Amino acid sequence: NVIQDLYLRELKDTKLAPSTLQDAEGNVKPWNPPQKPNLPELELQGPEALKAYTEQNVETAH
Amino acid sequence: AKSAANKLDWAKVISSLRITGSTATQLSSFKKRNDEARRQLLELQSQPTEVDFSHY
Amino acid sequence: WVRYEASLRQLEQRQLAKSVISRVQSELGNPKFQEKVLQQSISEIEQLLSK
Amino acid sequence: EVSSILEERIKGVSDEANLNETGRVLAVGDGIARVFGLNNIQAEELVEFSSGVKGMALNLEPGQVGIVLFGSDRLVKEGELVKRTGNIVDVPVGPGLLGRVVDALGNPIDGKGPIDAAGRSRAQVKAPGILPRRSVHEPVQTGLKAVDALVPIGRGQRELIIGDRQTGKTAVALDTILNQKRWNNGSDESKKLYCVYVAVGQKRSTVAQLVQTLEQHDAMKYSIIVAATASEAAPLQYLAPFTAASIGEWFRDNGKHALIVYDDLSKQAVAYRQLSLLLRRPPGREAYPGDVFYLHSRLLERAAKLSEKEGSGSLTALPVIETQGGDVSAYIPTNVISITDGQIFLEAELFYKGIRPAINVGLSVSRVGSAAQVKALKQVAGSLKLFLAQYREVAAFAQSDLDASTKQTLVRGERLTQLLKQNQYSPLATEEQVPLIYAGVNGHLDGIELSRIGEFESSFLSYLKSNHNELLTEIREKGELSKELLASLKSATESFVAT
C-alpha cells in the first residue's frame, strides 16, 4: 500500500553513481609492489679480515 | 641444533671464567646470541606469506 | 581497500536515505494520500472480517 | 546491492495484525508513564509505545499500569498509544553475538547489520541450584604474575576486582582477555572461554578506544562487547548487566566455558539509585535503595561453574567495583564484597608509586581460588604469598637496624616486588610465568642486583628457550613440575644466573 508507493518511488528514482577507483585510492592505502632490499654483504669477508685475524690473533688481552 | 651451540657456549662461559681472557669473548658471545635470538623472534614472528584471497 | 568499500556502501545508503525522505514528502502531497485511505479502508474491512 | 538489501527490507514490511494493544499515556515525565488500559498484561512485559520506544511494565495497579520508559522521555508524550509487545523482556542470545559490539537493545552498534542469534531469553533468569554446581577445577590465566600466583583465579567464580577509578581500571581485565587469546584461539573448546566485556557508564569515545584496542589485538572474534554508555539512559543501564548475563548463560548452557567482566557494577548502583528515586521508592544507606543488595546478588549468582549434568559450563564473573576514595566500608562495596568470592583490591597508592599493576596483597583474597591452580603453579608458587607477607611484615617494622635474617628477607622481598610488575597492556604467557616464579622462590633472584631485574626476566626467558625450550614444552604439557624437571630447572636457572 504505502509500501508500494514508497517502494516504487524510492527504488525507481534512486540511481547509484559512486566514486571512481581513482577517487577511492585517496581514501585507502595504495598497493605496494615487492620491496627488494637486495642482499647485504657482511664483514668477515675480504682479505681485510684475514690479515687482521693473523695479526690480531697473535696477541690478545686478559 | 641451536641448543647444542648454546650448551657448549655457556659451558665455555663458566670455563672461560677459570682462565685468562674475556676482552672480546663476551662481544662474540653477545653477537651470536643476538642474531640467534633475533632469528628466534623472527621464527615466531613469521606468518604465512600469501594473501588469503579466498575470503578477501 | 575493503574498509573504504564498506564506507562507500554506507555512504550510498545514507544518500538513498535522504532520497527516501524526499519520496515521502512527495507521497504525502498526492491525493493518493486521500485515495489510499480507501485502500486502507477496504483492507481493514477484509482484515477485520478475517478476525 | 545496497538497492537489493533495501528492497528486501521494504518487502519485509507486510501488514499489521489486530490484538490487544493500546493503552493511553496520561501522566508522563519523570521517566515513568501512567497508562490507561493494558487490562491483561504479563508482569514485566516489554511494551512498545507508538512513540517508537519501549518500556518495561513495572507496576500493575488496579486500573492503571505504570510503564518505565526504557529509553528517552523526549519522544514520549501524553495521550500516546502504548502497544503491548506481549512478551516479557527477552534479548537475542546465540553464538553469532561473538565479535559483535551491540548496545543494550541488542542493536548492532558495530553496525555489521543484524546479529545472528539462536534464541532470545528472558532478562531475569534464576541462578542454578546447589545440585547443578560442580566445584571449580579449571583455572583462568590472566598472564600477569601474582594475579595468577598470589591471586589464584578459577572458572565459574565471582572473583571481585575492586579498586579506584581510572587507575587504568579497565586494563587489568583487558590483559586477562588478551592472555586467554592463546587458549581461546586454541582448538580445545574446554580451553575456550568466550569472554564478554560489559561496558556500562563509560564514554562512548573511551569504548571506541577499547574496541579499537581489541581489534588491534584481533581479540574481537572471541569476545562480545555490550555497551551502555554514560550518555545512554539509566533504565537501559539498569537492564544492561542482566541482559549481558543472559547472553553469557547461552554459552554456559552450551556447557562451554565462558567469562563475563562486568565493568563497572558501581555505576549500575547509581543507575538503580536513579531509577528507584524516580519511582519514589524510599532510599537506603548512602541513598542507595534497599533492594540494591537484591539487585547485585541476583545478578552475581547467575555466574557459576555448573555440574557435569549441565555439561560443566562456566561463566566466570569478574565484577569491577569503583571505590570513591578507597572507601572499603562503603555500603555498595561491602555489599558486593559479601556476595563475591575473594577480592582483588588494587593498591592505588602503590599504583601511583610506580607499581603497575598494583595489587594490595593483603586486601586480595580468593575464597576457593587456590584449588583452581595447576600443580606447577602450586608447587612453584608455594608459600610465596607467605614470603611476601613476611616482606609485608619486614617492611612494616623496617621503618632502624636490620638483623641479617630480616635484611635477607628485605633484599629478596624488594626484588620480588619488582619482579611482580608488568608492562600495562602486554601480558606474559602462562608457560613463562612458571620459571619466573621458580627463580625467585628457589632463591636464584636473591643475588640478582635490583637494577638488572628487568634484564634478568627477559634474558632468563630467552635463555630458557634458546638453551632448552624442551623444558618449557614439558612443563607446558605436564603442568606439574616433576622432581627431574625441578632439578633440571634448578640447574638451568642457576646456569642463567651465572650469565
Curated annotation (Swiss-Prot), chain A:
Chief location category: mitochondrion
**Cellular location(s):** Mitochondrion; Mitochondrion inner membrane
> Which cellular component, as a GO term, is one annotated location?
mitochondrial inner membrane
**Tell me, what is an example of a GO biological process annotation in this record?**
proton transmembrane transport
Show which residues constitute the signal peptide.
none
Thylakoid among the record's keywords?
Answer: no
Keyword match Transport: yes
Kindly state which keywords UniProt assigns to this record, in alphabetical order. Answer: ATP synthesis, CF(0), Hydrogen ion transport, Ion transport, Membrane, Mitochondrion, Mitochondrion inner membrane, Transit peptide, Transport
Whom does it interact with, and what assembly results? Answer: F-type ATPases have 2 components, CF(1) - the catalytic core - and CF(0) - the membrane proton channel. In yeast, the dimeric form of ATP synthase consists of 17 polypeptides: alpha, beta, gamma, delta, epsilon, 4 (B), 5 (OSCP), 6 (A), 8, 9 (C), d, E (Tim11), f, g, h, i/j and k.
Q: Which family does it belong to?
A: Belongs to the ATPase h subunit family.
What this protein is reported to do is described as:
Mitochondrial membrane ATP synthase (F(1)F(0) ATP synthase or Complex V) produces ATP from ADP in the presence of a proton gradient across the membrane which is generated by electron transport complexes of the respiratory chain. F-type ATPases consist of two structural domains, F(1) - containing the extramembraneous catalytic core and F(0) - containing the membrane proton channel, linked together by a central stalk and a peripheral stalk. During catalysis, ATP synthesis in the catalytic domain of F(1) is coupled via a rotary mechanism of the central stalk subunits to proton translocation.
Spell out the note in the miscellaneous section.
Answer: Present with 6140 molecules/cell in log phase SD medium.
Protein name from the UniProt record: ATP synthase subunit H, mitochondrial
**Gene field:** ATP14
Residue span relative to the full protein: 33 to 94 of 124
Curated annotation (Swiss-Prot), chain B:
Q: List localization entries.
A: Mitochondrion; Mitochondrion inner membrane
This chain's function reads: Mitochondrial membrane ATP synthase (F(1)F(0) ATP synthase or Complex V) produces ATP from ADP in the presence of a proton gradient across the membrane which is generated by electron transport complexes of the respiratory chain. F-type ATPases consist of two structural domains, F(1) - containing the extramembraneous catalytic core, and F(0) - containing the membrane proton channel, linked together by a central stalk and a peripheral stalk. During catalysis, ATP synthesis in the catalytic domain of F(1) is coupled via a rotary mechanism of the central stalk subunits to proton translocation.
Family to which this protein belongs: Belongs to the ATPase d subunit family.
Tell me how this protein assembles.
F-type ATPases have 2 components, CF(1) - the catalytic core - and CF(0) - the membrane proton channel. In yeast, the dimeric form of ATP synthase consists of 17 polypeptides: alpha, beta, gamma, delta, epsilon, 4 (B), 5 (OSCP), 6 (A), 8, 9 (C), d, E (Tim11), f, g, h, i/j and k.
Any miscellaneous information on file? Present with 6820 molecules/cell in log phase SD medium.
Name by which UniProt lists this protein: ATP synthase subunit d, mitochondrial
Q: Which organism is it from?
A: Saccharomyces cerevisiae (strain ATCC 204508 / S288c)
Whichever gene encodes this chain, its name is ATP7
Swiss-Prot record, chain D:
Pfam families hit by this protein: ATP-synt_ab (PF00006), ATP-synt_ab_C (PF00306), ATP-synt_ab_N (PF02874)
Name a single GO cellular component.
Answer: mitochondrial inner membrane
The lineage's top-level taxon is Eukaryota
Any idea which positions bind ATP? G163, D164, R165, Q166, T167, G168, K169, T170
Explain what the record says happens when changing G248D: In ATP1-2; growth-defect
- Keyword annotations: ATP synthesis, ATP-binding, CF(1), Hydrogen ion transport, Ion transport, Membrane, Mitochondrion, Mitochondrion inner membrane, Nucleotide-binding, Phosphoprotein, Transit peptide, Transport
Instruction: Kindly list the places in or outside the cell where this protein is found, as annotated in its UniProt entry.
Output: Mitochondrion inner membrane
**Which GO molecular function annotations are given, in alphabetical order?**
ADP binding; ATP binding; proton-transporting ATP synthase activity, rotational mechanism
Is Flavoprotein included in the keywords of this UniProt record?
Answer: no
Q: Could you tell me which residues carry Phosphoserine?
A: S14, S135
Q: Where is this site: Required for activity?
A: S364
InterPro entries attached to this UniProt entry: ATP_synth_asu-like_sf, ATP_synth_asu_C, ATP_synth_asu_C_sf, ATP_synth_F1_a_nt-bd_dom, ATP_synth_F1_asu, ATPase_a/bsu_AS, ATPase_F1/V1/A1_a/bsu_N, ATPase_F1/V1/A1_a/bsu_N_sf
GO BP annotations listed = proton motive force-driven ATP synthesis
Please share what else the UniProt entry notes about this protein.
Present with 41500 molecules/cell in log phase SD medium.
List the PANTHER family. Answer: ATP SYNTHASE SUBUNIT ALPHA, MITOCHONDRIAL (PTHR48082:SF2)
Tell me the subunit arrangement.
F-type ATPases have 2 components, CF(1) - the catalytic core - and CF(0) - the membrane proton channel. CF(1) has five subunits: alpha(3), beta(3), gamma(1), delta(1), epsilon(1). CF(0) has three main subunits: a, b and c.
| Family named by the database record | Belongs to the ATPase alpha/beta chains family.
Recorded protein name is ATP synthase subunit alpha, mitochondrial
Gene designation per UniProt: ATP1
